[PDB]
DNA sequence: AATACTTTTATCAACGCAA
RNA sequence: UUGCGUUGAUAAAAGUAUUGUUUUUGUACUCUAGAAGCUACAAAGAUAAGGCUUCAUGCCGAAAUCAACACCGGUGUU
């Protein structure tokens, strides 16, 4: 009922979500009309947003919260392509269109160079997303490679020397 | 076919039908008239039977489809064998009658393979006329790469300001309802 | 200067074919006319603003017979230039109201806009309606690619040019392609002979190699477009190292020098010339081709 | 044994690779691509939605032709005179008899220009002044009055009255058009008996019918990827329901709503934990007993 | 169509195919060569594109059917757009390939309307050649008075001394069995 | 081919509470 | 690096309204019921060229994706 009332914002969406998602609900019309006027009454409180967690993990965690005074990141600490590199991370993490384009063309350059020559240990990029991406791919592929974050060709040559 | 004065009248009629300024036509590559020579050709001066073969074939190739030149030959066979046709109507009116007889045979025998579309015609300067004519083809007779073996070419003379609809069913219904307005 | 470059190719086919603006033309006699000609019309949108008066006096100090009212209602134009003598249109508006036309009484229509003969007709698309009287066009028609042909009986190259508006959704299945007969018309207009051999096709930012036959020189270009569509085979080129060609810089012996603006509009339809196409890797490994296939790609 | 280096820019990457034990260049290169302009997607989106508006206007006129031909009032639509004043017939048919062909003219002109419906800030002040005018007349009477008084009817145009100057505009709400069409159709129903009540419900459905912003385009058999009738055979209920985000650790589960029991007990627990008996005591106290607040919770 | 040197080779090939003495052909009414001028035309002297339009159209009208000139136009469209065809085979061999493709489409789609017969060709002196070629038509596309809209024209190159049988079924079986011997 | 309105979803920053 | 509460910037997608440009027609203005098609107002048609089937609160068309070719997500060369 919270899902149906949060997402839908007017009468027909609320009504047909209450009639169609609650299987064999058999709701009356009076309570539908009063939920319509209730959603109309609170727009600043009820159209707040969506919680960053899911109901599966939170139903995993609401009983556990009580018995110990423990915080969420430490609680989750306590509970715990085959050669080429993916386009998953670079198509998902988009800050700008410009950053997305430039980093994916650079990663195509990177993987062409690692196909042609061989193995590596030092990769230099003139941020942290691409860093831990390459670091986890190289640990998962068991390769010790340290990635660290005319004119541009010369400058890349200079920082490859540096 | 046969090249004579009736072919000259048919050429001038279909040029006045598809092109709206005459200098869109007589300056095409392969045809390539000049202004004084075009006035000589148009106003009865030059005999069409002693001209170049490639120029008259280029004019006929621009104005007519490949199936339509065959229908010109067949209507020329039927026309010069009757005194009613020869002494009553000019040749381009009988060619219109022959063409609509073939269209009605297409609509009667196999109605569910008649397709159509909007035809596009290049001028002398490279720019085309969008919507110059109406193409009507049989979909069974396709050669490949967008070519059809049996294909005709019409022009609508309606007085209403509503365009031909798109889609197979809607355009087929328009063609069946406006069978006196196209020519 | 042994550095290699690597560009990205632009080969998309359904882009902006033209403006969506519908223009009007008239047939008239303007300037140095020995015959009638077709003229794209224009319009001053409103004369009482700051821009409309400036555009009016610009047209007036260029040529007085460009205005359509100058040729179709002259005495009203005399009553238009009596205000411009003694002041301007805004002052007439704030004293006497709207500039009405000539009439017997004060009952003519008001004058807010004025049409004129703007320019001559260039690249267009004829979209004239059924029951119309003058031509109606769409302008700003962009180029897409080039097909390079070569015949042996003259020993020189010929060059085609396709636009974005030369393709079409077709009439039976809704595919995006160009027919073979319209392609024969485009081949006929650009001067390509029927018995030439198709070499390759060029998109924008596609690496071209020009070699000579008498003095063994080599130049490398980027293709841009298929400019100057009055005389044939002219191709616009761009450098391989930089972005511009500023100056009267020389390139090779037989081509010449760049013009004063900085644009490289050459004519590659000549003898004593030879063309290759370069297909680089993403690391810059130039591979040279001479024949692409058997026929140009026409169905998409 | 080799070291890779990249210089990342807006439209270029310069790249190199070295050996570092000798220091000779193994490769150098420059890769150049065009920039990621967001002005082109704005152009493409604007043109797509404008094309949809033009399409749906023409389809309203087509649906009106189909309704008028199915009920048998007019046979062909080629002899209709396009040189009659539609506002004069629209205000005349409120009390008199429209002659079966001027009725089609009046209804076609009314369905060509319906109104706004977001109302139910100078622009707001002008449309409220126009609503303050239309409380006693229909909009057809307003437009005919503006026509035969000032000569102009359309656009936004200013007129100098005897003592004041006011800019006029052609924007009315849809409710006024619906009221006027209902009045005209009831009077012509009193005159002409071929316009049944199902004709009036179908015409008013053509007139005031709009889509919902959470529906999108499409139909049951039209299968759009921009609307709720997805092309995979299913049918969504709200198209912003497949855009709601994922979980933070299990990236295949939908999120929860902030305004339920579960997230709210989780948030009170997270603010309370930085024992169990008075946790449950405070939780049942805030749950079941009313007149609540933060100062009251600290009390 | 297009008039060039390939049309000259096609004309000389089909003249050598149907007529057995060349002076049966070049003295026909409407064509009307002379002996020195025919040797000028045949041996490469005269360019075909600047001749009279009526003479070249009379030669093409004698050697080809009305549907076959349309197929010449369509094969000319397809031939000059491919380097395999343009640099491997001459134009008359590709026209033969196009013609047999159309015949196979006729035999596959509607086998029970294919009729045929023996063709008869008039010489320059008024006397005809009996059995000059084999006519193949579709019976559904009849205009009247013994004319067919879709009609083709072949010649058998068999090595056996047995003639084509008569009757619809027997001649259809002969055409289906000898599909490599006709040309 | 531009100017007025309505709505949804998501992401960056920075200002604090905690780790 | 991760969660909560504020407010700025942005991106993607959806629903509407009023003009603008342009064609015909009518009315006014002009010249002798005709003509010119300038200058206004009003209807109706079109609004990137076009195209589809299911017959309708119908639908698609201006972005990004990119070196080609041959053999089992990989594999070889100009």
UniProtKB/TrEMBL annotation, chains B, E:
CDD domains: AcrIIA6 (cd22242). It comes from the Viruses. One of its GO terms (biological process) is symbiont-mediated suppression of host CRISPR-cas system. This is AcrIIA6. The lineage of its organism: Viruses, Duplodnaviria, Heunggongvirae, Uroviricota, Caudoviricetes.
């Amino acid at each position: 009922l919270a899902y149906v009332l949060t997402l839908n914002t007017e009468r027909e969406g609320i009504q047909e979500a209450l009639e169609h998602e609650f299987a064999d609900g058999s709701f009356s019309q009076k309570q539908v009309d009063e939920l319509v006027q209730f959603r109309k009454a609170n727009s600043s409180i009820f159209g707040k947003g969506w919680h960053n967690f899911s109901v599966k993990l939170m139903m995993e965690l609401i009983p556990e919260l009580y018995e110990t005074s423990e915080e969420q990141m430490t609680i989750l600490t306590r509970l715990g392509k085959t050669k080429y590199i993916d386009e998953k991370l670079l198509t998902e993490e988009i800050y700008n269109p410009v950053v997305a384009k430039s980093v994916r063309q650079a990663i195509k350059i990177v993987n062409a160079a690692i196909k042609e020559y061989g193995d590596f240990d030092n990769i230099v990029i003139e941020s942290r997303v691409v860093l831990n991406a390459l670091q986890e791919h190289f640990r998962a592929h068991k390769i010790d490679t340290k990635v660290s974050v005319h004119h541009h060709a010369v400058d890349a040559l200079i920082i490859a020397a540096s | 076919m046969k090249i004579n004065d009736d072919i000259k009248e048919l050429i001038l009629e279909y040029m006045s039908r598809y092109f709206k300024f005459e200098n869109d036509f007589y300056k095409l590559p392969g045809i390539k008239f000049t202004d004084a020579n075009w006035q000589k050709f148009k106003n009865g001066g030059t005999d069409i039977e002693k001209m170049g073969a490639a120029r008259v074939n280029a004019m006929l190739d621009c104005l007519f489809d490949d199936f339509e030149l065959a229908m010109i030959g067949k209507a020329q066979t039927n026309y010069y064998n009757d005194n009613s046709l020869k002494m009553n109507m000019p040749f381009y009116t009988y060619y219109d009658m022959f063409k609509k007889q073939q269209l009605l045979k297409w609509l009667k025998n196999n109605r569910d393979d008649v397709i159509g579309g909007t035809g596009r015609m290049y001028t002398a300067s490279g720019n085309y006329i969008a919507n110059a004519y109406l193409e009507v083809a049989l979909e069974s007779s396709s050669l490949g790469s967008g070519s059809y073996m049996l294909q005709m070419r019409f022009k609508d003379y309606s007085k209403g300001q509503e365009p031909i609809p798109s889609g197979r069913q809607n355009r087929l219904e328009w063609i069946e309802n406006n069978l006196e307005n196209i020519r | 200067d042994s550095i290699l470059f690597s560009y990205q190719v632009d080969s998309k086919f359904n882009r902006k074919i033209s403006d969506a603006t519908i223009y009007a033309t008239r047939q008239a006699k303007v300037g140095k006319d020995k015959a009638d000609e077709t003229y794209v019309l224009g319009k001053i949108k409103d004369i009482y603003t700051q821009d409309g008066y400036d555009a009016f006096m610009k047209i007036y100090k260029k040529d007085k017979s460009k205005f359509l009212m100058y040729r179709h209602d002259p005495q009203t134009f005399e009553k238009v230039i009596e205000p411009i003598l003694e002041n301007p249109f805004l002052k007439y508006k704030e004293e006497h109201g709207y500039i009405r036309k000539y009439s017997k009484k004060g009952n003519g229509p008001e004058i807010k806009s004025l049409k004129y003969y703007d320019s001559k007709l260039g690249n267009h698309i004829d979209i004239t309606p059924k029951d119309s009287n003058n031509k109606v066009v769409l302008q700003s028609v962009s180029p897409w690619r080039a097909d390079v042909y070569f015949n042996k009986t003259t020993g020189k190259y010929e060059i085609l040019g396709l636009k974005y508006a030369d393709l079409q959704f077709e009439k039976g299945t809704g595919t995006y392609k160009i027919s073979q007969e319209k392609y024969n018309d485009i081949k006929k207009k650009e001067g390509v002979d029927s018995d030439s051999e198709f070499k390759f096709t060029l998109y924008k930012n596609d690496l071209l190699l020009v070699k000579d036959t008498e003095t063994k020189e080599q130049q490398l270009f980027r293709f841009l477009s298929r400019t100057m569509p009055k005389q044939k085979h002219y191709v616009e080129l761009k450098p391989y190292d930089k972005q511009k060609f500023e100056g009267g810089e020389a390139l090779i012996k037989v081509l010449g020098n760049v013009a004063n603006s900085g644009q490289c509009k050459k004519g590659l339809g000549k003898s004593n010339i030879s063309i290759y196409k370069v297909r680089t890797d993403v690391l810059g490994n130039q591979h040279i081709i001479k024949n692409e296939g058997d026929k140009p790609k026409l169905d998409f | 044994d080799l070291v890779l280096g990249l210089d990342i820019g807006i439209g270029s990457v310069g790249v190199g690779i070295l050996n570092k034990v000798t220091g000779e260049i193994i490769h150098k290169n420059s890769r150049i691509f065009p920039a990621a302009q967001a002005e082109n997607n704005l152009v493409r989106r604007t043109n797509r939605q404008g094309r949809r508006l033009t399409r749906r206007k023409k389809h309203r006129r087509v649906r009106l032709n189909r309704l008028f031909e199915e009920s048998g009032l007019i046979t062909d639509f080629t002899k209709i005179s396009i040189n009659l004043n539609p506002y004069q017939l629209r205000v005349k048919g409120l009390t008199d008899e429209l002659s079966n062909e001027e009725l089609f003219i009046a209804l076609k002109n009314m369905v060509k220009h319906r109104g706004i419906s977001y109302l139910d800030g100078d622009y707001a002040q002008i449309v409220k002044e126009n609503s303050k005018q239309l409380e006693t007349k229909t909009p057809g009477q307003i437009q005919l009055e503006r026509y035969q008084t000032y000569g102009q009817l359309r656009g936004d145009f200013t007129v100098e009255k005897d003592g004041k100057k006011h800019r006029l505009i052609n924007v009315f709400p849809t409710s006024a058009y619906r009221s006027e069409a209902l009045r005209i159709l009831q009077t012509q129903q009193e005159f002409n008996p071929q316009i049944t009540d199902e004709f009036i419900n179908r015409y008013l459905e053509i007139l005031t019918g709009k889509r919902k912003y959470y529906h999108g385009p499409g139909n049951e058999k039209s299968r759009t990827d921009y609307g709720r009738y997805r092309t995979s055979g299913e049918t969504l209920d709200n198209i912003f329901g497949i855009l709601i985000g994922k979980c933070t650790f299990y990236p295949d589960e939908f999120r929860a709503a902030k305004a339920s029991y579960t997230a709210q007990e989780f948030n009170l627990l997270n603010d309370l934990n930085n024992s169990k008996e008075q946790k449950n005591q405070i939780i049942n106290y805030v749950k079941n007993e009313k007149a609540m607040g933060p100062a009251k919770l600290f009390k």
